[PDB]
Every structure is written in structure tokens, then in C-alpha cells.
Amino acid sequence: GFTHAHIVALSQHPAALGTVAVKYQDMIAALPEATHEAIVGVGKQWSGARALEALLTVAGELRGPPLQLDTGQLLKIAKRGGVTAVEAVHAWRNALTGAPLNLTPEQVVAIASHDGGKQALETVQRLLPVLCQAHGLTPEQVVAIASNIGGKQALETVQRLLPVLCQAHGLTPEQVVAIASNNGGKQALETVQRLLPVLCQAHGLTPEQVVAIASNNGGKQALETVQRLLPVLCQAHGLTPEQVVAIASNIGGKQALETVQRLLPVLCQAHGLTPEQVVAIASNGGGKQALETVQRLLPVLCQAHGLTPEQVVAIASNIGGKQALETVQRLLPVLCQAHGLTPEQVVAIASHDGGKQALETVQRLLPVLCQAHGLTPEQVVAIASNGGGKQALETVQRLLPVLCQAHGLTPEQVVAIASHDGGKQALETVQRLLPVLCQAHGLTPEQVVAIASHDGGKQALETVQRLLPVLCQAHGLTPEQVVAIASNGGGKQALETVQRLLPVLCQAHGLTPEQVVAIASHDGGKQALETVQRLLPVLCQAHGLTPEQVVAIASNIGGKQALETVQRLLPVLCQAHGLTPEQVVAIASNIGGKQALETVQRLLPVLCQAHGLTPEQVVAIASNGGGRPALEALHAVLTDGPEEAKYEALMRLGGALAIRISDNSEKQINTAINLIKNHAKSKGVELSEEDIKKVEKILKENPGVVLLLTPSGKIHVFPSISWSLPEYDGTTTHGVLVLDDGTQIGFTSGNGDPRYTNYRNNGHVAQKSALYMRENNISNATVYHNNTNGTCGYCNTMTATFLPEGATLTVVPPENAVANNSRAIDYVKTYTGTS
DNA sequence: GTCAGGATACTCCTCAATCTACCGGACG
DNA sequence: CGTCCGGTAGATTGAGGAGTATCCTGAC
Ligand SMILES: [Zn+2]
């Protein structure tokens, strides 16, 4: 039974049609459990009929002990390699395996399943000892080189001119193997050998960049195109050579470069696309197709489908962006008006590699997954919004009942496992390994699910299964420690690195095994461990850092980057910026500490001088997580923005006194001068006669001005912002303290007294007012605050503790305030200090 | 019958940022 | 019973770079 479509597809090779029509029963007898798709795939090739005949003749012998080839392997060899490859495999069963070559049957299948794989097999047989002995090449590397179309030519060219690149050009064997491990690797290798000095000297290209260009399929064309078009794109189009290298470092990079040259003016002057966006679109595999599709479909997808150009760029910035864009154009109304998906969900689904497949699979499987399995559409969208999401969706549809029934997993656990790149592999690995891990090693299903949730969870699960009996016995590690190490992105690498490096780190550098486990329990923990091993003596000896400080720096997600940045920037920050090593270590000991350190180095002079941000304030701002965005936002709001916005941004730094004396009132001016002098003395900074005269001039010149004394000493002056309290934003509460004379003092919630940290009313506006009255000896005051929830119970009860003996503070909430609970208050209240 | 170049899809590993979730100490 | 408070630890959320894999077309 053959489908008419199958016959139409197979009609490419009429001899295969005759062979299938005549001896199909023999085909299925020699190859049991062979699907029709495999048969039509094998037959339709250039030698389908003869390959099928040879497979029928040989499959009775190729299943022998030397190879034990599966039916699928035989079908793949016959479909890809051809009849010649099958005959060569049959004729050299004894020579390939169990020989000095020492090739496993999988390697033989991988080598032979290529166009002209018989020649590759013959060449690898003839040259394996030569490259393994003289050139010192691993058999894995030789197999990888020979497992490509035209692998014989690449292997011969490597054997001929590996030393020429190793000595006369300084190219390591790994780089040459990477260059020659692609289709037509002989051409790329010869092109590198001919053009490396020219590109490195005349065009100023690093050999790493040239190798990166050539390490792709058809890299000779990319190299020649870079040589020809570097000046044109660098000068006439204003493109950085690194951008050109990034464009040309993909498969078909010559096409991308030519398309960029031809379409940059059009996309930049007729569609409003920035050159950075064009470069981002073209910096992916098949970028010429993506650029042409964007040029054709931007008006259609923007005017009609209501998609912003940024969404179209994000969709088109992936591999196969043409397919994703066409699929979005075709299926946006279908997926929106029928399946209920919002357009942003469709864009999120389509914004990955193979987004067309994900979109089609979502369209096909959303009712099935939502109705038969009870999955929420948000869960299906979350599964699909990943690389290879079609495979994950199909695997979920196949394995949800068995995983939720046999192993007792909940559907939420399965969805969490499958919501990552390669979630199909993780799901299959879980379904295969959970009984083994749980019954033998004692792991609980929750631990297995936690291990398998992250990216590459199949590798982590296999590594855990292989290494737990070794790590937990030889190195004395608790199974919880092993699970914690493995439950991270790239946890296989961290597990192997720990197994290799725990003894040397625990005897030479003296680190505790707990410290090693803490270092290795983060993303990229292998790199952090290697960096610790390399840099611990250097940092501890030259820079005077204790091992605990280095461990604290490295125990983060970017520990390697933070350690390298500390090594680079400790002296320059210490001597040219006046920062103690403790502050540098505190900045570096956070997620993304490299960015924080670089931002501190960049912005310390401007913040400390132009704005007067005491270095301690900058260090405290950067010492928290997200130091780079916080510093950037503070600098941006300081350089330009509403005066009120800068006012709050500089209240939130702490230690600043805002005063808004009213009228001229010379007595009132002297009182304000006394208050600002007292605050400056408390901060240990003397304003001196010039600043005192300037501030009197400012107060006597502009009515309604507000003064702001920074702890550094700078007196910010805002001529006019507001005479009324700003609207409550829900996070920061503002207050104004009014004395008898009339001067107003601005207060902001938070940044409470460090001495009274144990009090539950620290940082509150009423507490701050009471503390100010106590320090400045003010008998009577009224504080108006803007919080609509009213004064909390803490300040209701504990305010009188801070007020001086025989004082009075009147708290006033806004008129429209409503109490948020029973303990709060909602009216003006007078507090008298006690003894 | 091989060899080369291009397009597309899937899987794995680092890095950076933000988001919860508790935890702590004194007064009517 | 009451945080306009911070600190610590853990968990998502997102992006980017790299590796692996297959298939199709064109040319001798
Ligand atoms: Zn309060």
C-alpha cells in the first residue's frame, strides 16, 4: 500500500519504482519493521534501485557480530551513502572494526553515510595511522574530518599541509581541524593557506577571526568576499570590520555580504531600519533570504498585520527568518481569531530557530493538547516558545500520560521539563532513567526533575548517573551536593570539572570542599572553577586578597568574568580612584560584577565631581545586584530630567538635607544658615565663607527656591519644583517638617538611621522628623506626609522614644487618606517626648 | 558518482538582570 | 497587631554564542 503522493515523490528514479513494485516483499523480509517513508527516501536517490538490491543481498550478513547494524542504520547508509557505500561497508567489515584502525560501528555509519562515502572510508582506512602517529591527531578528530561530503579531499589536504599551517602560520591543530570539518574543507583550507597573511596584514584581521570565517560551510567564498568587500562596506557604508566579520561568519556568508552591500541604502532610507538592525538580521544563517524577505514584507506586515518593525526584526533575526516571516504573515489571523492567541504570543513563538515549525505545530496541536490533556494555552505557548519547540510539543503529546501515570509526575513537572531547549531529549531521558536513578542511587523524583529542568538536562542526567557513585564515594560528596551542582545550566561540564579538580583545589590551594561545591553550583561553574585554579595564587599574592574573598567573588554566575575584571582593575581603581580593596571586592561579589566594576570605573569621576556623589555613595549603589543599570539610570536622571525627578533620585541616596525657607525674613535666613551649618558639621564638611555667602545670595535672590546639601558638600539649588507634596507613588513616602519660624525640611522614607536598625519604625518619615528634632534641638514641629495609608502603628507607638524631653511633633496625613488596617491612624496626631 | 555551497532546524553552555521569600529587633 | 525597612538566598526571565544535524541544488 503506497500513497499516490509517495509514488509521485518516488517517481524521480524509475528503476527504484520498478524494484519496489517487483520485490517489495523481499525488501520487508530483509528489513523488518521498515516504514514506507524510509523506502521512498532510499529509492528516490541517484542509485535507489541498486542500493535497495545491494541492501537486500547484504543485510543478511551486515547484522553480524562485527557490526550488528540496525535496520535504521542500514537504511540511512543506503539512502545517503548509496550503493557504492553499502558495498564498501560490506567488503571492509573486518578492516574497519577490530583492527588497528579501531573504529566503532557508529563511526563507520557516520563516515559511510555521505555523498561518496566509499572514498571517505577508503581514505580514512589508508590514512588513520599516518595522521594518528606523525600528526598526533586523535581518531575522533580524523572521524569528524572524514564525516563530511568530500571528506577524502579534506583528509588528504590536512595530511598534506597541516605542518604548513602549524608552524609557518601558527595555527593550532584544533583550529585546522575545525576549518577542515566542513563540506568542501579542502577549498577553505587552501584559501586560508593562501590568504591568511594578506587578511592579517593589509586588512588588519586577527587569525582567530579569519579561522572563524573559514570554519563554516563554503568558507572560501566568505573569505574571498571579505577580502574584496572590506573597504567598500567599511568606508562607503560605515560598517565596523567586526560587524563584517560577524556577518561573514555564517553559512553562505558571501551571499549575506553581497546582499548587505546591495540593500543597506534601501533598508536605511526607505524603511527606517538602522544599520545595526540590518547587521543583526544579516548576522544569521541564510541572512540574504532574511534581508530580501524583510525588504519585501515590511510594509505588508506593518500596515496590515499591525506589527511594529521591532517585532518583524526580532522575528527575522533567527535562522530561517524567511520561513518564520512568511509563516507569520500566513497564520497570524488564523492563530489570532480562532485559537485565541494574542499577536505578541505568536511573535514570541516565531522568534526562535525553526519558528515556522513551532507555529505549524501549535496550530495543529493546540486543541489536542488543551482538550485531551487539559493543558492551558499559556502552557503550550511556553513550551513552543523555545528552540526546537515543535519536537517538545510532539514529545509532550506523546509522553504526557505515561509520565503522569507510570512515574507519578504531575503535568506541571512535565511542562517545566519540556519548556527548555532540547526538551524532547530531556523528556525521553527522564522517562528512561527516572526508575534507575530513584531505585538505585536513592534520588527522589523531585531531584531528578530539578536536574532535568535546565538546558541540556539529558546530559546532566546521564552525567549524574555515571558520576554519583564516584563523586559520592571517592571525594566524599553528599548526594545533595551532587544534585545541587548538577541542577544548573551546563551541569555536566561542572560535574566533570568538579570530579577532575576537587583534589588539586582541596590540597594545593587549601580550599574546603564546601567552597568548591559552592563555586561550582552556578551557571558556568566549570569556567569559574578553572579561573579560580588559575588566578588564586596571583590574586592572593600580588593583590593581597584572602582566599575567602576570591571564593566569594567567584561564587556567582559570572564568576570567571568578575575574577578577571578584579585582576585587571584592582590597581587602577585603588590608586586612581581612592577605593579600598574591600569596596572593589564588594562590588565584584554580585551577579554581573564585571559590568558593575566597569561602570564604576567609567562613571566615578563624573558622578563624584559634576554631581558631588561621595565615592562611598557610588560604591553602595553599585554593591547591589544590577549595579550597572542602577548607575546608568542615576547618571541619566542626573544629567537630564525633571528637577523633581532629580530631587527624588538624590533623596534616595541618603544623607542629603533639603530646605525650603519661605519669604526673606533675615532672622529666618540666619536660622536656615545655622541648620545647614549644623548638618554640614555632622557630615564633617566645612562650607566655608564663599559657599556661605553664595547660599545667602541664593536665598535673598530667588523666592521659593529649595536648597539641597549633599554629604560631599555640594549645594544643589532648585529654583522652583512644587509648593505641594507630590502624588503618592506607592513606594516612597515624602514629608515636609515645618518649624515655628516657617522653614520647611524635606524628608524621604527609607535610608534610616544605622544605629536604630533594630527598631521597626526605622526609616519612617515620623521617625526621621523626631530624630532631626532631637539632633537639632527643636521643641515644636509639624510634619505633613503624603501617604494615603496614614501613620502606621509602629510610628503611632514608638515615635515618642526618639523625641526629646518636653518636645512636640504633630503628624498630619493627607485629607483623602484611608487607613490600610486596624493599627494605623488616619488623622492629625500630636506626640510629646518622654524621658 | 563525487564535490561544493547554501538554507534550515535542533541542542547545549554562559552571562546578566529582575523577581519573590523569608529573616531579623522593641513599644503601647 | 502593627514597615514608609534592608539583607540574604533562591528562583525565573532573557539574551547571546556555539555546536550538531539534515537536506537540497548545482556542476562536472
Ligand atoms: Zn510609619
Short mmCIF file of N, CA and C in Angstrom, two decimals, chain A residues 152-221:
data_model
loop_
_atom_site.label_atom_id
_atom_site.label_comp_id
_atom_site.label_asym_id
_atom_site.label_seq_id
_atom_site.Cartn_x
_atom_site.Cartn_y
_atom_site.Cartn_z
N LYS A 152 37.26 12.85 1.71
CA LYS A 152 38.55 12.33 1.26
C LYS A 152 39.50 13.46 0.89
N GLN A 153 39.00 14.46 0.16
CA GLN A 153 39.84 15.59 -0.23
C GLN A 153 40.29 16.38 0.99
N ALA A 154 39.39 16.61 1.94
CA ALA A 154 39.77 17.32 3.16
C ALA A 154 40.81 16.55 3.94
N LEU A 155 40.65 15.23 4.05
CA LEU A 155 41.61 14.41 4.78
C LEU A 155 42.98 14.44 4.11
N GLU A 156 43.01 14.32 2.78
CA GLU A 156 44.29 14.37 2.07
C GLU A 156 44.95 15.74 2.19
N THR A 157 44.17 16.81 2.10
CA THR A 157 44.73 18.15 2.22
C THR A 157 45.27 18.40 3.62
N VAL A 158 44.56 17.92 4.65
CA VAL A 158 45.07 18.04 6.01
C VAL A 158 46.38 17.29 6.16
N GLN A 159 46.40 16.02 5.72
CA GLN A 159 47.63 15.24 5.80
C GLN A 159 48.77 15.89 5.03
N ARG A 160 48.45 16.63 3.97
CA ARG A 160 49.50 17.25 3.16
C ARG A 160 50.04 18.52 3.80
N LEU A 161 49.17 19.39 4.32
CA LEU A 161 49.62 20.73 4.69
C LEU A 161 49.22 21.13 6.11
N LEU A 162 49.07 20.16 7.02
CA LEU A 162 48.92 20.52 8.43
C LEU A 162 50.15 21.22 9.00
N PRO A 163 51.38 20.72 8.81
CA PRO A 163 52.54 21.45 9.35
C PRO A 163 52.70 22.85 8.78
N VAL A 164 52.34 23.05 7.51
CA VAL A 164 52.46 24.38 6.90
C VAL A 164 51.63 25.39 7.67
N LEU A 165 50.44 25.00 8.12
CA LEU A 165 49.63 25.89 8.94
C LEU A 165 50.08 25.92 10.39
N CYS A 166 50.64 24.82 10.91
CA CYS A 166 51.01 24.78 12.32
C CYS A 166 52.24 25.63 12.62
N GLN A 167 53.29 25.53 11.80
CA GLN A 167 54.50 26.31 12.05
C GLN A 167 54.54 27.61 11.25
N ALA A 168 54.43 27.51 9.92
CA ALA A 168 54.59 28.70 9.08
C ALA A 168 53.46 29.71 9.25
N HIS A 169 52.35 29.33 9.88
CA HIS A 169 51.25 30.25 10.14
C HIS A 169 50.83 30.33 11.60
N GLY A 170 51.35 29.46 12.46
CA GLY A 170 50.98 29.49 13.87
C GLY A 170 49.55 29.12 14.16
N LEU A 171 49.01 28.14 13.44
CA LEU A 171 47.64 27.67 13.64
C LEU A 171 47.67 26.35 14.40
N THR A 172 46.96 26.31 15.53
CA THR A 172 46.92 25.10 16.33
C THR A 172 46.16 24.00 15.58
N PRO A 173 46.45 22.73 15.88
CA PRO A 173 45.72 21.64 15.20
C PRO A 173 44.22 21.69 15.40
N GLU A 174 43.75 22.20 16.54
CA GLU A 174 42.31 22.31 16.76
C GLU A 174 41.67 23.25 15.76
N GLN A 175 42.31 24.39 15.49
CA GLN A 175 41.76 25.34 14.53
C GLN A 175 41.74 24.76 13.12
N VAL A 176 42.80 24.06 12.72
CA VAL A 176 42.83 23.46 11.39
C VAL A 176 41.78 22.37 11.26
N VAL A 177 41.60 21.57 12.31
CA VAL A 177 40.57 20.53 12.29
C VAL A 177 39.18 21.16 12.18
N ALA A 178 38.96 22.27 12.89
CA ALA A 178 37.68 22.97 12.79
C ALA A 178 37.47 23.53 11.39
N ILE A 179 38.54 24.03 10.76
CA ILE A 179 38.43 24.56 9.40
C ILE A 179 38.11 23.45 8.41
N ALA A 180 38.73 22.29 8.57
CA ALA A 180 38.59 21.19 7.61
C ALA A 180 37.45 20.24 7.93
N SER A 181 36.62 20.55 8.92
CA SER A 181 35.50 19.70 9.30
C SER A 181 34.18 20.13 8.67
N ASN A 182 34.22 20.68 7.46
CA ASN A 182 33.03 21.18 6.78
C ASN A 182 33.03 20.71 5.33
N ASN A 183 31.88 20.85 4.68
CA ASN A 183 31.77 20.47 3.28
C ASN A 183 32.69 21.32 2.43
N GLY A 184 33.45 20.67 1.55
CA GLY A 184 34.45 21.39 0.78
C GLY A 184 35.53 22.00 1.65
N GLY A 185 35.98 21.27 2.67
CA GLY A 185 37.00 21.78 3.56
C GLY A 185 38.36 21.93 2.93
N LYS A 186 38.63 21.21 1.84
CA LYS A 186 39.88 21.38 1.12
C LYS A 186 39.99 22.79 0.54
N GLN A 187 38.90 23.28 -0.06
CA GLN A 187 38.91 24.63 -0.63
C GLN A 187 39.13 25.68 0.45
N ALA A 188 38.44 25.55 1.59
CA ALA A 188 38.61 26.51 2.67
C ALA A 188 40.02 26.46 3.23
N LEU A 189 40.58 25.26 3.36
CA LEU A 189 41.92 25.12 3.92
C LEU A 189 42.96 25.75 3.00
N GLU A 190 42.85 25.50 1.69
CA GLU A 190 43.77 26.11 0.74
C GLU A 190 43.59 27.62 0.69
N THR A 191 42.35 28.10 0.78
CA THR A 191 42.11 29.54 0.78
C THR A 191 42.73 30.20 2.00
N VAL A 192 42.61 29.58 3.17
CA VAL A 192 43.28 30.11 4.35
C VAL A 192 44.79 30.13 4.15
N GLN A 193 45.34 29.02 3.64
CA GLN A 193 46.78 28.94 3.43
C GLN A 193 47.27 30.01 2.46
N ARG A 194 46.42 30.42 1.52
CA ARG A 194 46.82 31.43 0.55
C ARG A 194 46.54 32.86 1.00
N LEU A 195 45.56 33.07 1.88
CA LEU A 195 45.07 34.41 2.17
C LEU A 195 45.27 34.87 3.61
N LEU A 196 45.78 34.02 4.50
CA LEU A 196 45.95 34.43 5.89
C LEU A 196 46.90 35.62 6.05
N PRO A 197 48.10 35.63 5.45
CA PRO A 197 48.95 36.83 5.58
C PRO A 197 48.32 38.09 5.01
N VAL A 198 47.58 37.97 3.90
CA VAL A 198 47.01 39.15 3.26
C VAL A 198 45.93 39.77 4.14
N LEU A 199 45.04 38.94 4.68
CA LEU A 199 43.98 39.46 5.54
C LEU A 199 44.52 39.92 6.88
N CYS A 200 45.55 39.24 7.41
CA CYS A 200 46.08 39.63 8.71
C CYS A 200 46.92 40.90 8.62
N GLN A 201 47.57 41.15 7.48
CA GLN A 201 48.47 42.29 7.34
C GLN A 201 47.76 43.50 6.74
N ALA A 202 47.23 43.36 5.53
CA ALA A 202 46.64 44.50 4.84
C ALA A 202 45.31 44.92 5.46
N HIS A 203 44.45 43.96 5.76
CA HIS A 203 43.12 44.25 6.27
C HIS A 203 43.05 44.27 7.79
N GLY A 204 44.14 43.95 8.48
CA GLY A 204 44.18 44.03 9.93
C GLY A 204 43.21 43.10 10.63
N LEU A 205 43.17 41.83 10.22
CA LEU A 205 42.25 40.85 10.78
C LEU A 205 43.01 39.87 11.65
N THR A 206 42.48 39.61 12.84
CA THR A 206 43.08 38.62 13.73
C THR A 206 42.94 37.23 13.12
N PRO A 207 43.96 36.37 13.26
CA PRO A 207 43.82 35.00 12.75
C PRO A 207 42.64 34.24 13.33
N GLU A 208 42.22 34.57 14.55
CA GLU A 208 41.02 33.95 15.11
C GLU A 208 39.79 34.31 14.28
N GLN A 209 39.69 35.57 13.85
CA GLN A 209 38.56 35.98 13.02
C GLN A 209 38.58 35.28 11.66
N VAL A 210 39.76 35.17 11.05
CA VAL A 210 39.87 34.50 9.75
C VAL A 210 39.49 33.03 9.88
N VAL A 211 39.94 32.38 10.96
CA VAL A 211 39.56 30.99 11.19
C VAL A 211 38.06 30.86 11.42
N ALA A 212 37.47 31.82 12.14
CA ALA A 212 36.03 31.79 12.36
C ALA A 212 35.26 31.93 11.06
N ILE A 213 35.75 32.77 10.15
CA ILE A 213 35.11 32.91 8.84
C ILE A 213 35.19 31.61 8.06
N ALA A 214 36.36 30.97 8.08
CA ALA A 214 36.61 29.77 7.29
C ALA A 214 36.05 28.50 7.91
N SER A 215 35.66 28.53 9.18
CA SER A 215 35.16 27.35 9.87
C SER A 215 33.69 27.08 9.58
N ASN A 216 33.15 27.64 8.51
CA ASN A 216 31.77 27.42 8.11
C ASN A 216 31.73 26.75 6.74
N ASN A 217 30.54 26.32 6.35
CA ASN A 217 30.37 25.64 5.07
C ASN A 217 30.53 26.64 3.93
N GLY A 218 31.37 26.28 2.96
CA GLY A 218 31.70 27.21 1.89
C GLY A 218 32.46 28.43 2.35
N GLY A 219 33.42 28.26 3.26
CA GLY A 219 34.12 29.39 3.84
C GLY A 219 35.11 30.06 2.91
N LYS A 220 35.52 29.38 1.84
CA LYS A 220 36.41 30.01 0.86
C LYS A 220 35.74 31.21 0.21
N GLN A 221 34.47 31.06 -0.17
CA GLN A 221 33.73 32.17 -0.76
C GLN A 221 33.60 33.32 0.22
#
